[PDB]
Paper text:
RV is a non-enveloped double-stranded RNA (dsRNA) virus with three concentric capsid layers encapsidating eleven dsRNA segments. The outermost layer contains the glycoprotein VP7 and the protease-sensitive spike protein VP4, which define the classification of RVs into G and P genotypes, respectively. RVs use the [name]* domain of the spike protein VP4 to recognize specific host glycans in a genotype-dependent manner. Our studies show that [name]* of these genotypes engages the type I precursor glycan (Galβ1,3-GlcNAc) at a unique and conserved binding site that is present in all P, P and P HRVs, and the subtle sequence and structural changes lead to an altered glycan configuration at the reducing end in the neonate-specific P RV, that may play a key role in the age-restricted tropism of some P strains.
However, although the [name]* structures of P HRV (DS-1-like) and P HRV (Wa-like) in isolation have been determined, it is not known how they bind to cellular glycans due to the lack of their structures in complex with any glycans. To investigate how other prevalent HRV strains recognize type I glycans, we determined the crystal structure of [name]* of a [name] HRV alone and in complex with H-type I pentasaccharide at 1.6 and 1.3 Å, respectively.
Numbering used by the authors: 62 to 223
The structure:
Amino acid sequence: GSILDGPYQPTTFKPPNDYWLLISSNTDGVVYESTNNSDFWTAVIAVEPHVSQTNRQYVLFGENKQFNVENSSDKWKFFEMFKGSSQSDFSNRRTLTSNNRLVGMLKYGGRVWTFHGETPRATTDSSNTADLNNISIIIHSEFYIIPRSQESKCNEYINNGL
């Protein structure tokens, strides 16, 4: 009784406004890398359950980066790593803890919205940008597309599973 647009194969593109990208995650590492090359960089890093503090390397926007990471929980963690200018540092802005292993990204009202917190009570949160139009995302896994008018379904998928 339900129809979902997708899956789409891993790709690089500029997502339209008003659509959720529901991005699957199939492994530890970089889930996606999104930037407009002016005031918005977000890369999501997946860390598998039960990882004690450890150093790992990730390729973010063409550069090798080292992060000390930890996941004490029995759920996957998806760390949003953000920087707000080209020469700013990355910081962990927000995190989704979820064994549903799905993350969401919406361009809407001059902002980027994502889900954070711990499922099944994950909620949406925003980052402001002056250049939404040029945000381009590299997605390293299969994803689906859900119109914002169907956000309630994206919420259910993120929180309760696909």
